[PDB]
Amino acid sequence: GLEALLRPKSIAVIGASMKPNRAGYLMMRNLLAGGFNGPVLPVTPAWKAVLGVLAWPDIASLPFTPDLAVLCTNASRNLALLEELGEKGCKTCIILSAPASQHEDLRACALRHNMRLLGPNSLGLLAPWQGLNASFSPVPIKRGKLAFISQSAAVSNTILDWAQQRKMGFSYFIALGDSLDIDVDELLDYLARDSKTSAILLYLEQLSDARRFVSAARSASRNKPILVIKSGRSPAAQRLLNTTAGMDPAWDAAIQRAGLLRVQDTHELFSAVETLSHMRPLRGDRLMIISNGAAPAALALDALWSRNGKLATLSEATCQKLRDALPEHVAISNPLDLRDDASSEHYIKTLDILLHSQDFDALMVIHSPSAAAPATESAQVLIEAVKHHPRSKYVSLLTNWCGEHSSQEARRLFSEAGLPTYRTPEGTITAFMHMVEYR
């Protein structure tokens, strides 16, 4: 079972230290700043207390048996310390590092004592909904609905850095190592059955057996969307990561069979973070665009033309109602309303009429900063308009404020309201087509 790992009641840190240059120091500091509801027990004979908590000399002197143990000491002692834990009767242990050998002895000891190991060379585990931060990372995280699984410690740290700097909230964050005892298939069931999770993200570098992977992914793919990214495609990348080479086209077949989706690079990955949260599931594939300039929409159309997307056609009643809002807008005869010096008033007069129809399934609003319509005011007005409409529940919304310097506050307000937002055009179209293809 994985309940002593994802929901422990007590934790023992073996190797806790008062030296700031240590992993035990960081582990203790992360654990005491999370909001855990159980005891944290430091085990060391080199201090009497660590960060204000009384310490114990050895494992045998612990007052009771713990649920979880984290080994922050060196690798040389590994095989001894594990044995002691087996005598005490603990259930799971997280190992920081191993020298690439003694995997056999580690597995033998674990099987002998009925213990579960989180792969060596693992960055750790973060469970915000329990206030658990059993990790070695230097950046904080927040509560959310997105679960992430990663394979390599270098990958784990790079991705968590990119994520926290992307700020997005998370439900779970597990960093496997050599996957000696706990693997992806086992975690997939637990994550699928979980309620705080809304989507799952993977970063794979190698696999042990693909049969169980495909089986479990197939089982879990009908609950929530699941996305993948793989990086072993070129010979230099193959040699630097020490992985086999000649199976790439089979990976696409397996991913298709399991019902999952694949992304190419990390530039589409923060778009994936923005779209998995803040965006509600679609009901169709018809798209409507509005903007205050010709070129941006054009740049979008080409992109939508290269992925075989669908546009929306406007009813004659909606076309008539839109007319008389302002003259010299021929754009009433195309699914891209067009203006040059429009004010926020035109924006609201368009939004209210458009939201009343049944003509499309998603709306894309583009803004190029201008004197007539400042960014912050337009953002506030759009947010309130979406708030007060009764039809906003049945429509998906996408925003694109195209001014980097002057649109930071507007983007922050959008994020607070829970609205997706993207830096450049054809970054919105990529997300829209991703979701359509998934459906």
């Binding site: 086992e186 059955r193 049969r211 495909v214 089986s215 197939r218 089982s219 009908r222 609950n223 397996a254």
Partner: protein
């Protein structure tokens, strides 16, 4: 997909390419290779496509001997149609016992309305919860290796209506399993639950498991009576109100 990505041209000749014939040829290839494991490599080059006709010009086979089980070598396993059964009930009524399919999700949502509340509890991770719609939808997507589910179905006016469900989930090491049974209201006393349990016992013992575990309420007397009829262990937990059922398959 191959044509659209321009990996294969559609009108390389004066005539278009028919897809039904090519798909049938691929299905035949799949049947042949899955049936015969002695084949290790097959190469058809060139393959002559002339309108509605397809022919092989040169074919090469590389074969090797021996094979363990002929099934573990694959990644996706098919539907076990040899477990499909017709059963005449206690009162002479006909129904069909068969494994579950993804198409049964709608029928499953109505059948859950007309089911008593007490029996809707199960044990997950040292906790007691009760079935919801998501649980049934998940139950429809199955691999028939580590988890199994049977349904009892009736046919009326070109619709299928479900009467009873049973499920069994096995552990990674193949030494334990957990079971659950659900029956509809106004259907009690007809032995349907007993038949489903017997069908589950047969399948599980053939799979190669050791024992079977379950739980139910103490107030519910029908299920405990049935388990006693089997004569298999029933323990009662005090201060919690849960009765644990153990069935050792030997």
């Amino acid at each position: 997909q191959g044509i659209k990505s321009k990996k294969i041209r559609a009108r390389s000749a004066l005539r278009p390419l028919d897809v039904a014939g090519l798909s049938q040829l691929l299905v035949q290839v799949s049947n042949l290779i899955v049936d015969c494991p002695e084949i290790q490599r097959l190469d058809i080059h060139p393959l002559l496509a002339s309108g509605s006709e397809f022919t092989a010009l040169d074919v090469t086979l590389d074969i090797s001997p021996f094979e363990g089980d002929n099934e573990s070598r694959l990644a996706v396993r098919p539907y076990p149609h040899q477990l499909e059964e017709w059963v005449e009930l206690k009162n002479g009524e006909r129904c069909l016992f068969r494994p579950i399919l993804p198409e049964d999700e709608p029928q499953l949502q109505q059948f859950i309305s007309r089911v008593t509340k007490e029996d809707l509890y199960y044990r997950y991770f040292s906790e007691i919860n009760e079935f919801t719609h998501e649980d049934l939808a998940n139950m429809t997507q199955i691999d028939y290796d580590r988890e199994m589910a049977f349904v009892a179905v009736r046919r009326i006016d070109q619709t299928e209506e479900i009467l009873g469900v049973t499920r069994a989930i096995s552990d990674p090491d193949n030494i334990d399993a957990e079971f659950a049974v659900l029956v509809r209201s106004d259907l009690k006393g007809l032995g349907l639950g007993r038949r489903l349990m017997e069908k589950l016992i047969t399948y599980t013992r053939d799979h190669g498991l050791q024992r079977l575990n379950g739980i139910t309420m103490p107030n519910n007397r029908g299920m405990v009576a049935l388990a006693r009829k089997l004569g298999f262990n029933v323990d009662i937990q005090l201060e919690e109100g849960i009765v644990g059922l153990t069935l050792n398959l030997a």
